[PDB]
Design a protein around this ligand. Structure first.
Ligand SMILES: C=CC(=O)N(C)CCOc1ccc(Cl)c(Oc2cc(Cl)cc(C#N)c2)c1
Lengths: 519, 402
């Protein structure tokens, strides 16, 4: 008899105002009852459960498949909440040796809070229901109870805390009923330290017996030098799962595209994706001594792809970013948002911001943020000359243009008929009014600006009273849902100088020709 | 000596806020800070039976090269029961100094039943190890109940200094003391050292502000030659101001804009137009009519980026009834970083708002949520944190404040 240190129990209580479970035991067959009786007798002989009298008014149903299955769904619904994020392999650091240990015997060795055991009561029905069924309650964390994973991992972590503190030269990872220990020591010293851990676990009475890499873990394969997703094979079909698997493959296979399949057969086929999703690709592990680099490319249609690496051509991981769903957008905003996501993902996985390589000129970025009406910022980055380059497509003037014709524009529409008009008058006497069907005030205000853009020289001043149109153009979109806006954008790209001025409507500002447009 | 009873609001549970990702240097700083606080008994490890959580991070205050722990107690503060005064003269004082008195709270124990609600998590890089989980034993920094509880002891340490210097206005907001004096700058610096020494005698350990000249006037250009464009922008600004000031009129000025003229053509002002401009000027010199403060309503702060390191802001409770407008133009290690500038502007506007009204405003930030949420903690230096929302549509009115 060597004295075993007791595992401190975790105080557990039921949700407030809720009482324990009271579920009726399902009728069982005679052979099932015999099977359960044998199991529970060995479990009782082991300490996992204990017979109880009839004062206990709680019950949870039991089944057999033998194996005992206690259905704790009801007790889980009434149990308090517990403090509940998985590693990414590109964050792991290589180790010379990595050993695995089985700590499944410790799961049934973690006691349950006494005052809560009564809530775990279950009844084995008796043969022909002519005696009272056998009554048991749990003394250990029941597999299937709400608090078992959180209490189990928490108890193991407290046990391993002194060992990890006194051995900074090793690393311990807890996953399911197995512990993973790695180090960079010589194979002799590393196997020594594993024996110390078994000794240390014996101080709490935990028995470890005496996987082989590659490890298969959470959909990955972890090799001593590389990692990759578990084999992903694109499917061959004539007539979501392809989305999830490509999204899962996107973290290592560069260039996955999921927009049209994310968008009922149709086309997609890009949807081959096989080119890469058929050749095998692997990521490297993290080396804290080398710098961390992230590179982004524009792929089109709001899609972006990126690689994070430390040495050229050996990626730690890869990814993609999709444009946010909106009415208007531009490339710089998207690239900014992609930078922010890669920034947060990198802080998660490596605890630092990567150095960025971006397809935008330094001068383009400076023009953008100094003139953008919002505050904006991307962390340290350098230009990489990988087309397509992100660029500004147009830039409005800050002052009226001398010698450029002045177009006063206006549009208006009837809410009932959907009939309206758009047009302009200029200082040279140029004039136009177009009649329109199936329109709104908003569309006619855009169309009036469009007309001025079409009918003016390379330099033009445009005067509108549309707060709606100025709201859109001041957002500096390079692409829209509205074909009207996209046609205005295409006209703005062809101009040399555009000055857009706003005036208040119906205040008597001249040229503001609400009368021609409302005729 | 004896913990004060504390409870949450009726029908409300403790906070359960996700911890956001921290860099490795911030994690290490928190590990060292928290290990020390555990030894001092200020915090204690907790188990899986505690489900609550409040975010934590680390900062470096001004003129200090030491990391500091900041807890984002905003959720707990909202859910913490109101605890059963604001000096109108602090805003009128010539100068006001701000002293961090946060360590004082740690000498006071916290009600055992409430501690579970102060839980926080030091996170691990790459989710490798489980988060280090702690709860507070003593009054924590940034909790709204910490000054409310400590207030009785604070009056005891103040009353000697207060009787000795009765021209000094003293105010406490969260972890800060605001000490204002109508004296000269040398007279202030000495008295603040005297107050810190007086605090150090009671065991208290303490590791520049002057009022603005309240609502900045709306001003109109004075030109000898107006182009069509000049007059269009004037009429735009006058139309806008008319939502705020009653008798603003634009008829005579708009009449000049009659016809379809070139934007750069000079228009001479008629004599009726110059009088209308002059009447509008005079109107604009007077104050806005019927502008009061209501402590039941929230304060709203709007900020506009004007470029070249200039920022305009307005505080108000009701639209067009500004209680305070201002302009912040200082770039402190920020001339290349918009977000740092915005973060410093939000902290200055919040401080102004604490002095004037003793509570923080709700900000409307000219920035996308995802950019702001990625970066502001990198430049934050205050022990409180206000609320904010995001404006994604460019306000037309930005230049009318420029
Ligand atoms: C010798 C192998 C090696 O160097 N490899 C695998 C790369 C680095 O990888 C490590 C290092 C150290 C530990 Cl302790 C570890 O152990 C784990 C971690 C996780 Cl997240 C899951 C499993 C499983 N299932 C095992 C892997």
């Amino acid at each position: 008899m060597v004295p075993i240190s007791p595992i401190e129990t975790v105080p557990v209580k039921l949700k407030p105002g809720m009482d324990g479970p009271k579920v009726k035991q399902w009728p069982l067959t005679e052979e099932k009852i015999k099977a359960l009786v044998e199991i529970c007798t060995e479990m009782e002989k082991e300490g996992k459960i204990s017979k109880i009298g009839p004062e206990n008014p709680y019950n949870t149903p039991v089944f057999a498949i033998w194996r005992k299955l206690v259905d704790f769904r009801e007790l889980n619904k009434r149990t308090q909440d517990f403090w509940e994020g998985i590693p990414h392999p590109a964050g792991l650091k290589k180790k010379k040796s990595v050993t695995v240990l089985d700590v499944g015997d410790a799961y049934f060795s973690v006691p349950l809070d006494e005052d809560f055991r009564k809530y775990t009561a279950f009844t084995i029905p008796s043969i022909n229901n002519e005696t009272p069924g056998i009554r048991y309650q749990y003394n250990v964390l029941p597999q299937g109870w709400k608090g078992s994973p959180a209490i189990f991992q928490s108890s193991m972590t407290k046990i391993l805390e002194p060992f990890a503190a006194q051995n900074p030269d090793i690393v311990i990872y807890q996953y399911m009923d197995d512990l993973y220990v790695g180090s960079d020591l010589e194979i002799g010293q590393h196997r020594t330290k594993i024996e110390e851990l078994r000794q240390h676990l014996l101080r709490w009475g935990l028995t470890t017996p005496d996987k082989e890499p590659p490890f298969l873990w959470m959909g990955y394969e972890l090799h001593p030098d590389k990692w990759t997703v578990q084999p992903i094979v694109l499917p061959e079909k004539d007539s979501q799962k392809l989305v999830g698997k490509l999204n899962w493959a996107s973290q290592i296979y560069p260039g996955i595209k999921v927009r049209q399949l994310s968008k009922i057969p149709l086309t997609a086929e890009l949807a081959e994706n096989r080119e890469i999703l058929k050749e095998p690709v692997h990521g490297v592990y993290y080396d804290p001594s080398k710098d961390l680099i992230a590179e982004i490319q524009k792929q089109g249609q709001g899609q972006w792809t990126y690689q994070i690496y430390q040495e050229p051509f050996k990626n730690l991981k890869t990814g993609k970013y999709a444009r946010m769903r909106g009415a208007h957008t531009n490339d710089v905003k998207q690239l900014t948002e992609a930078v922010q996501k890669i920034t947060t993902e990198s802080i998660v996985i490596w605890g630092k911001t990567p150095k960025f390589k971006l397809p935008i000129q330094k001068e383009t970025w400076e023009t953008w943020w100094t003139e953008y009406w919002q505050a904006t910022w991307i962390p340290e980055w350098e230009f990489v000359n990988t087309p397509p380059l992100v660029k500004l497509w147009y830039q409005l003037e800050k002052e009226p243009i001398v010698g450029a014709e002045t177009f006063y524009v206006d549009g208006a529409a009837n809410r009932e008929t959907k009939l309206g008009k758009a047009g302009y008058v200029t200082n040279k006497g140029r004039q136009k009014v177009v009649p329109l069907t199936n329109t709104t005030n908003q569309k006619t205000e855009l169309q009036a600006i469009y007309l001025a853009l079409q009918d003016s020289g390379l330099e033009v001043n445009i005067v509108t009273d549309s707060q709606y149109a100025l709201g859109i153009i001041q957002a500096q979109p390079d692409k829209s849902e509205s074909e009207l806006v996209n046609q205005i954008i295409e006209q703005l790209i062809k101009k040399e100088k555009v000055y857009l001025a706003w005036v208040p409507a119906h205040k008597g500002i001249g040229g503001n020709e609400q009368v021609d447009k409302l005729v | 000596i004896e913990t004060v009873p504390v409870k949450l609001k009726p029908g409300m549970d403790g906070p359960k806020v996700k911890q956001w990702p921290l860099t490795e240097e911030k994690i290490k700083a928190l590990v060292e800070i928290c290990t020390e606080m555990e030894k001092e008994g200020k915090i204690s490890k907790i188990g899986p039976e505690n489900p609550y959580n409040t975010p934590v991070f680390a900062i470096k205050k001004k003129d200090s090269t030491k990391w500091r722990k900041l807890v984002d107690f905003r959720e707990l503060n909202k859910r913490t029961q109101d605890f059963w005064p604001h000096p109108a003269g602090l805003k009128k004082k010539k100068s006001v100094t701000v002293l961090d008195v946060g360590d004082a709270y740690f000498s006071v124990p916290l009600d055992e039943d409430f501690r579970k609600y102060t839980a926080f998590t030091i996170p691990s890089i790459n989710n490798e190890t489980p988060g280090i989980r702690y709860q507070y034993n003593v009054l924590p920094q940034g909790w709204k109940g910490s000054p409310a509880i400590f207030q009785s002891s604070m009056t005891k340490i103040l009353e000697p200094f207060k009787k000795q210097n009765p021209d000094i206005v003293i105010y406490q907001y969260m972890d800060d003391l605001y000490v204002g004096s109508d004296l000269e700058i040398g007279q202030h610096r000495t008295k603040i050292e005297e107050l810190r020494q007086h605090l150090l005698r009671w065991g208290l350990t303490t590791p520049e502000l002057h009022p603005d000249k309240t609502v900045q006037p709306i001003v109109l250009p004075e030109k000898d030659s107006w182009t069509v464009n000049d007059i269009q922008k004037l009429v735009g600004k006058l139309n806008w101001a008319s939502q705020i000031y009653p008798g603003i009129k634009v008829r005579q000025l708009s009449k000049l804009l009659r016809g379809t003229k070139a934007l750069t053509e000079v228009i001479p002002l008629t004599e009726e137009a110059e009088l209308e401009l002059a009447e509008n000027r005079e109107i604009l010199k007077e104050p806005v009519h019927g502008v009061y403060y209501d402590p039941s309503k929230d304060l709203i702060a709007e900020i506009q980026k004007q470029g070249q390191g200039q920022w305009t802001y307005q505080i108000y409770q009701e639209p067009f009834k500004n209680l305070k407008t201002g302009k912040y133009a200082r770039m402190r290690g920020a001339h290349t970083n918009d977000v740092k500038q915005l973060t410093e502007a939000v902290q200055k506007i919040t401080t102004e708002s604490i002095v004037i009204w003793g509570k923080t405003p709700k900000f409307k930030l000219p920035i996308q949520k995802e950019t702001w949420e990625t970066w502001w903690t990198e430049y934050w230096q205050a022990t409180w944190i206000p609320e904010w929302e995001f404006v994604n549509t460019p306000p037309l009115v930005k230049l009318w404040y420029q």
